Each structure stands twice: as C-alpha cells, then as structure tokens.
Amino acid sequence: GADGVGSSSGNWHCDSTWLGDRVITTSTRTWALPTYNNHLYKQISNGTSGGATNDNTYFGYSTPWGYFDFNRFHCHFSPRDWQRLINNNWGFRPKRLSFKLFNIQVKEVTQNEGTKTIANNLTSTIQVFTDSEYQLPYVLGSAHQGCLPPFPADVFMIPQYGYLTLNNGSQAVGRSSFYCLEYFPSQMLRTGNNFQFTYTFEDVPFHSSYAHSQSLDRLMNPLIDQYLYYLSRTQTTGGTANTQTLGFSQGGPNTMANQAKNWLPGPCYRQQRVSTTTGQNNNSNFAWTAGTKYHLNGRNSLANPGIAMATHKDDEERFFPSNGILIFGKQNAARDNADYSDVMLTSEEEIKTTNPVATEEYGIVADNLQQQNTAPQIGTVNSQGALPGMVWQNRDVYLQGPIWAKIPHTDGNFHPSPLMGGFGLKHPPPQILIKNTPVPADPPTTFNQSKLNSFITQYSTGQVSVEIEWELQKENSKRWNPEIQYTSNYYKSTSVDFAVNTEGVYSEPRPIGTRYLTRNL
Amino acid sequence: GADGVGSSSGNWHCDSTWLGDRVITTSTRTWALPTYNNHLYKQISNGTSGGATNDNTYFGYSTPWGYFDFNRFHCHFSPRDWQRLINNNWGFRPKRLSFKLFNIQVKEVTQNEGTKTIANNLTSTIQVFTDSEYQLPYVLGSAHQGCLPPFPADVFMIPQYGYLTLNNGSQAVGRSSFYCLEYFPSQMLRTGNNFQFTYTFEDVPFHSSYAHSQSLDRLMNPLIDQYLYYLSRTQTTGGTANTQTLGFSQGGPNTMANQAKNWLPGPCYRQQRVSTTTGQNNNSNFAWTAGTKYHLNGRNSLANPGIAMATHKDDEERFFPSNGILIFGKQNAARDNADYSDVMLTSEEEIKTTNPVATEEYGIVADNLQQQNTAPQIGTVNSQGALPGMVWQNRDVYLQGPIWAKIPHTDGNFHPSPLMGGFGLKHPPPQILIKNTPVPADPPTTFNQSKLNSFITQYSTGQVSVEIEWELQKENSKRWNPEIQYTSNYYKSTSVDFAVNTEGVYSEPRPIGTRYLTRNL
Amino acid sequence: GADGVGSSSGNWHCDSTWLGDRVITTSTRTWALPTYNNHLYKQISNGTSGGAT
Amino acid sequence: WELQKENSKRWNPEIQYTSNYYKSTSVDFAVNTEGVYSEPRPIGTRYLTRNL
Amino acid sequence: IPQYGYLTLNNGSQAVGRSSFYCLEYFPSQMLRTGNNFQFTYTFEDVPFHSS
C-alpha cells in the first residue's frame, strides 16, 4: 500500500506444506553484504612464474558484486521434512520458485582514532538484478561455499562474484572476454523498497530415489531352463588323451552365469582403491600420481568424482575409490590436511545392482585369435564407453548436496546429468547479483579529472525469502515385508543429533542419502 | 505464357537478400552436358588380381546419366556475404530451396576429315528427373569434384553418375543390386521448355558458429572454496620415517585441478602427430602404416578425418594430426604428391575448450589394485567412447566445405552429425539426374534384331538456378571488449585476394572457418 | 506514485537495443558535486602584465 | 540513433576492425590488476568501402 | 562535475564596453530534495548522416 522507513517491507516465512503430490518449501534468512574490492574490478591471475604448476594456472576478473546461492538442499528442507520425503516417495522434481528480498537496512561505519561507531544511512541504495537471458558466466553449480545456512537462526555473509576466462599460462588470449556488471538494467532499492521475481522450471525427469530389489543379471526365472544353448565343452573328458570337440548345454538354475541376457551394466572408468584402515594401504604418497585424471588442453585435471559407480562390493565397506566419492566435512573441520575422523564419506553402494564397482574392471575380452597352434589370450577392460543395451543409475542426491547444475550450451552431449548429482537444466534458475551503491567522500573543491578513490565505509543487511514448489511421485508397491527406513538412533546420547550443542553451534552428524525404498528392475 | 525457340525460358538471378533472421541466396550458372559411355551402362570393377590391394577392391556400375551437385557452401555465398554471416551471427540453418533449369540448347557436332563443325539441333530433347523417394544410391555428400564453380562467370561440366554395390574381391555377391535409371518417370524437354521443383528442409539444429569464452574445467569461481573435500595426503611428512595416513583438503583457488566438476570432455580416438617442419618428423614413410584406421569386414579403412578434436594445443601450431583434418588444395595444385605449399590446412584449434587434443591421450586410469605390498600402477586411455556427462563440439564448416550429408537409414545411430561437417538429414535435398536423349544414325534398310550402336555425336548446354532460404540466429551478448572478426589484409599486395589474376583465373587464398564470435559455456 | 526519503527515485539503466535502423543507447553514472568558489561569482583574468604573451 | 544500412555488391571481403588474436598480458579495453580502466588505441569510424 | 565559467570580450587583461555578465541565479530552475527527480527530452533537428 504505502512504503516508507516506518513500515516493514515483508513478513518472515519458513514453512512446508504437504498437499497431494505437491510440497511447497519456503525459507527466510538474514544476510549482510560487505563492500568488496573497494568498488573495483580487478584482473586476477596465477601462473607457473611462481611455484604454481601448469595445471593450476588461471586468468579472470573479480567483481565488486555479490550473489545469492540457494543451490543446496538443506537450505530448503529441515531434516524432519527430508525424512518425510525420502521415506514415502519414489521421486521428485522442482516445479516453480519465488524469490523475495526485503527489509533492507544500510549502515555506515566510521573510524575515529580507536572508537568504532555504526549509524543508519537512510538515503543509501543497493542495486539488484537477475540475469534471465543467461548473458553472464554462470558460476553456480560448482559447489562453492556461501549458500544459505542450514539452520534458520544463522546470519550469513554474501559471497563475492568472480569468473574465469581463457588463458595461456598466466596471460590472456584474444578470445578472452570481459564483462562489466554495471552494464545491465538493474533495480535500485532504498530502505523502503522490496524486490521479487518468479521462475518456472522446464520439464525435467524425476530424480529416482530408490534401490532395485533385483540385480541386472538375476532377472531370470530360477525354476525353468532356457531354450537357448551355449558352448560348454571344448574338449573330451575321461580319456587318457583328450581331443578337442564341441558340446553345448542349456542355461538353467544350476549355472546362471552362462545364460543369455538382454542387458548390460553401465559404463566403467576405473578408480584407484583406498582402504579406510591406514595400515593396509601402500606406504607412499600416490594421491595425485595414482589418481584418475582426464587430460584437456595439455592440462591434467583430476576427475572428481567421476561417473556414477558402486563404491564397493559386499563386505568391502572399508574400501572407497580414490577421488570417486563425495566427501563432506564435519562441523568445525580444518580446511587443509584434515584427519579422516573430521570428514564424512558418502557411499553409492545402493546402486551395485545396475552399475559396476568403481575399483574393479568392467570385464574381459579376447586379445588374440586362437589356433590349434596358439593358445587363446584374454585382456582386461579398465575403461568402457557406452554400448547399445546399457542401463545405469545416476548418483544420489544428499541433504547437503547441490540441487541443480547448468547444462553447458554445446553442439551435443550424452545423458546430461551432472556428475555431482542434481537436475541438469538448459535454463537453470537465474543467478541474482547485488551490490552497495558507492557513496563518495568529500570531493576536492577544485576540479580534477581522475576518478574518485575515496568512499564511505558502508554495508547493508536485510532479509531474503525463497519458495520452491516440488512435485512428488507417490510410492505404489505390493511388497509384503517391511521397507528399510531412515531413522534416528534410539539409544541415549550426550546431545541431540541435528541440533545445537551447549555453545549454540548447529551441526549435522552424517550425510543422508535419498535411496531407501525399493523397486523391481 | 507462350514458349518456343524464339522466347527465352528464364532470367538470370544471382542475389542475396538480408531481411531480419532470413537470408535468401540465389545463384545461376552455365553448364554443359556431354554424352557419357556412348549411352551404355557398364559394369566397372577392380580387384586384387592386379596390383590393387584387398582394401581398394570395388564393384559397381557406371551410368550414362549425369547429375547436379550444389552441396558446397561457396556455390551459394560470395566471400563478402560469407563475411556478413560469420561476423554477425551465432548460428544458421537452411529452410527451403528452389531449383530451376532453363534456356536449353542442344547441339550436334560432326567430323568430316579434318574439319569440325557444330550446329543446333532444334528437335532433340533431354531427360530430367529427381528422386524424391530416395530410391537410388545417394551419391552426394562424399565431397566429390564437380559442384558449381565458386565464381559465377565459369562454365562447368556436369559429372557422370555411378555407384558401388556389395563385392567379394572383384566379384559380386547375391545381394548386389542393379538400378536402371531409365526406369523412373522423367520429364523430357526441348529447347523451349524449363524444369523446376521446390524442397523444404526438415527441422535441423542450428549450426553453432562461435568459440567458447570459457573452458570446460575452468567454470569454477576463482574467489571461493568448495565445501567438498578430496584426498590430498597418503603419507605423513617431516618425519625421518613416514607412515601411511589419510588427510583431506578443500578445493580452492590455489589448487583448481583437484576440485569436483560436473562435466567431462568429449570422446577421444587418438591420431598420430605430424610436424609441418619436415626435419622434426621421423625419417620413414609412416603415412599408411602409422595412420589411424578402422577395420570393417576384413578391410582396413583409414579414418578420415575422424571425430571432431582440437588440432593442437597452445603454441603447437606447427603440429597437425595425420589424417585428422580437412585439407583443401590451392588453385592449380597437382593431383598427386603435391607439395606442402600447394595445399591449405584447416585448423580446429577453436574447440580446445570442450574437446581433447587429437594427438594426445584422453586421460589416466588405474591399472592394478594397490596393497601395502604392491605399488599402484596407472594406464593410458588412447580411445574413449561416450560416457554420461560428456559434452563436445562438432567440426567447423568452411566456405569450401560440404553443406549436408544423408544420415544412413539404420536401426540406430549416435549423434548423427556428419564427420566432415554439415547438417545431417534424414531426407536431404533430392538428387537430380539429367541425360541427352540418344538419337540414332541411319539404320540399315534391312531389319536386324541387334540394338543400334551408332549415334549422332551430341551435347547440350543451358542455365541452372538454385535458391536457398537460410534462417539466422542473432548474436545477443553483453561482452564489453571487442570481438575477433574476420578481415582482409590491409597491407598492399600484387593481386587482390578472392579475385581474378592477370590470366583470368579465379582463386581462393585460404579456407575460412565459421567460428569467430564467442559465448560462455 | 509516492516519493519520500525511503523510496528510490529511479532505476539503473545501461543497455543498447538494436532494432532495424534504430539503436537506442542508454547509460547511467554516479556523480558528486562539490561547492565551488564558496558560492561566489568571480572575475577571472590574465594579461601581459605578467609573463603571459 | 538512426542507421544507414550497408548495401553493396562488392565480391571480396571487407576490411573490418578486430581485436588481436595473439596472447597478451592483459585484455584490451579492460581493467588491469590495479583496477584501472584503459583504452589501448583510438578507433576510427571508416572501414567499409564505397564507390565515388 | 566540472565548474562552469565563460569568457567575454577583452582588451589586454581589461574589459570593454560590450563585455557581458550573466547571473545564473536569474533563470527559472527546479529545486530538488532527496525525494525528487528531474528529467527532460530533446529532439535533434535534421542532420546529414555522418559518412563512415
């Protein structure tokens, strides 16, 4: 109706509504936006001139702007809600979202000798816009820090926006592009204004959350023989001198490894195996050398995690592929050289049925061409691309994991599902940029052409709301016996899981996968 | 209105019209159609009975007919028009075409002793038809010579039509098929008639003409750390005796080779590397032996060019893959054993971002399974198929290159984009066949059953017009700094580029790629 | 609609639009205006009395 | 602004204005390490050609 | 924002009779506080295209 400094722009909303196949999750947080780079664009670079190896060189710019990132699940779901979701449902996909930004304060702080003081600046503004035409480097989806906090009572700091471009060493080539963010139409807000927009997701396949109750090779009937034959005997038996001969048999219950099958496991690109028990591992540093890397433009890049694979086979739980998994840190984990007990290892073991084990070969093929003179030889397939009749599962999404990623714009792609897990999108949710409008200090009395480098130390805070509507796929199954469910531990504990401790620090005990309920292949 | 020998059938058209997102290019040429094979079908063959190796054997027929081929770009675009196109636009695709054939003369030449004389034959006809049901071997798209000339003032000769069929050695098998082209309904034209038809392309994705301003591995934010971890340490350090241990770290600006990534480069099938500087290459003839070949039906076939890959990495310009590029000849180049200075080498270097370098491996994988007893081992991937989450770019189209190719009719295919570049089409533009109607010489006075082998030496000429409507994808980009453009050299020269020389010979100095403007991944 | 110290007067615009034979370029900048001459008009002059030619 | 479209039958390619393809320490028409914006060269308006 | 000043007829450092003096406060102007804005439009007269 009427906006001003005395009225409030918007109301707090955190809620989740469950109706039929829809669930609508809304959230609200409090943010604080500092001034970055003293309002300057800057060329940032790193090159082999220093100690940096040729692989880590980069060239790019760092903008004064800042951006909102809600791309992680736990922003939108309380652990309880996540439990309603993964226990009762096969799959889900987002439909549409809404975004609101309101109740803006802008404050200016000054330093006089040793005293610090902070006072409202009522006339200052902030600038906000969204890129809806995707005309900027899209920097979301790389799993950077700085999303909304999982716990609504936390106040968070908005990250700085920057991007990278083509480089040769530390230098730049001709195609290198430079973007000036002030060059887009944006909306300017004072303390009595608010900002909002809506967005509608394109059709996306449901994320399958479930494990297969069968395995790809066991689809057969155990009771009945096949009518097809296979080559079971190359040589006579029982004789003192055995000669080569041919004989055939029908696949049956006794030998099921020989039966014909319609389908093949998903592709395999091998990882190195590492044991959680230290003593069993080799004594050396093989992490970077023995890692599984892909080579692009004379630059070796570790492949992290890589394509979706089973972490380990039965009773192998102490083993995990080198880089082939997602690893989340526990609360108050060190940044570098953190101990094993400070991190949380995800496990893809649920997909063992459809996909091959990450640390083992795909299969065996014939190397040579046999003769009565020469013996047959076999060979091992470490890397296997796609073949007609392969089926595979994507990687599981976690409560801490990213929701979506932008499918790059290219001539062609193969199954465009982000490797880190999520929903691939041609047109992801537009990224939102925000900046404090610079306010100069006292200019000189005599004209000078040079730009003004002196400004008023300033920052702004406010509220942000995001609301996403999700579509659910109900679970319809005739299974007689009980399912596996996700459940909290019944035994006593010093402190409640997913709750604040004595000091008020919120923490998450373990990652939570999405696959519990079962289906038939 | 009224057609006859005195009226003209059609008017000359060469023009290009630029309206909005459409551009309509029309062209006209003068052709001459000789009599081939003395009006005879003939079995042609080659086999290992001679010096020919088993790989080059073939079996097929050569028809008296002849056909029109406009499949190359430079037929439809003047170099200037090609410059308007590639500088201002991201992509384009054809919409519909028109074809006209008119102003037909048919002349008969006789030899009397040493004198030669040529006179109009007013009553003779020619036969023309198009196969719109695709019931013939489709011979276009193999980049054969004989398309329309690039320069409108040239008169060209129509090529002869022939096709190949299944063979075993020089012989033919049972499935070998024989087609009689007189067995189709065709239209017969005298000097007062004209021929035309229209065609409408099926929906086809725009050809992407642009380079990526980013690279596939650099999509990350340089400023912010990831919240994921990786395995950075397998062993203690600083001690006199170091023991195996586990430690983890977060990917960050300093080490970007270790960060998790959502996508992978396109597939890789390696090529042998050759230096343009002769001295650096090995001394031997490895061209055929060390080439990259695919084996089909006991017959080795060189893979030319192969799938799209970057020609070379940074500052490698002197290197090119063996057969993995397109090579165009300069004007008046020799047919066989031409010198390096007589040919023009295309370069795919623009796609380095998305696709791997053609001459280097795809990556590294783990060969063995480590233990405290045994060291880990690594292995190299030379050939890599498709894996989920790969992105790639197609090969660039050139002003001299082919426009389209017919996607073979098969059960299944993978990304059906022709390797030589172009638009893959289920129903390409129908191919057009043309022949002089045979006119017998004086038959004997007494009946004889044998067919008449004596004919009047004869040929025909006329005009041909083709008009194609193209659809454009406008370039909308916020990049601040200037683009790279294609431009002619400012410095003085003996003769103008893309123009006739003193002797009247038209020539093209260099190939012209389509990728200049830039985009973000 | 209603202007005051809490509302913002206008929105940032920098854009260029290409339509047919028209192109429309808009721009926006931030300025700072000092007080000159202590709010005084002043006669300024220079002459050959000094070193000036 | 009002534009006058270029309608010309010239066969061979025009001269265009284009950025340098070769590598460089810093991008032209962009901020440097210190954040100072700079313009490398003046840019004239005459490239396309006409007949007298 | 630069300072506004202007020159007039002179003889040496002195001024002649035709020298004019303008008082800028003598024009109608619009006064704005922090809640106000200012705008106007303008239309160029017909001018020949700049030949590039």
What keyword list fits this structure?
part of a larger assembly; 5 chains; eight-stranded mixed β-sheet; 2 helices; 34 strands
Concise structural overview:
The structure is cut from a larger assembly and holds five copies of chain A. Chain A is mainly beta. Chain A has helices at residues 73-76, 79-88, and strands at 15-19, 22-33, 42-46, 58-68, 89-112, 115-120, 126-130, 155-157, 160-165, 167-168, 171-172, 187-189, 195-200, 207-208, 211-212, 229-235, 244-250, 268-269, 273-275, 293-296, 299-302, 319-321, 327-329, 336-338, 343-345, 363-366, 378-381, 383-384, 404-406, 412-414, 423-425, 432-436, 458-474, 518-519.
Q: What is the general shape of chain A?
A: elongated
The rounded Rg of chain A comes to: 29 Å
- Quickly give the structural class of chain A: mainly beta
What's the story with the biggest beta sheet of chain A?
Answer: 8 strands, mixed
Q: What portion of residues of chain A is helical? A: under 10%
* Proportion of residues in extended strands of chain A: 25-35%
Distance between the termini of chain A: 57 Å
* Chain pair forming the biggest interface: A-B, 119 and 104 residues
**How is the quaternary structure best described?**
part of a larger assembly
PDB class: virus
Keywords: AAV8, capsid, empty
Entry title: Empty AAV8 particles
Chains A, B, C, D, E: Capsid protein
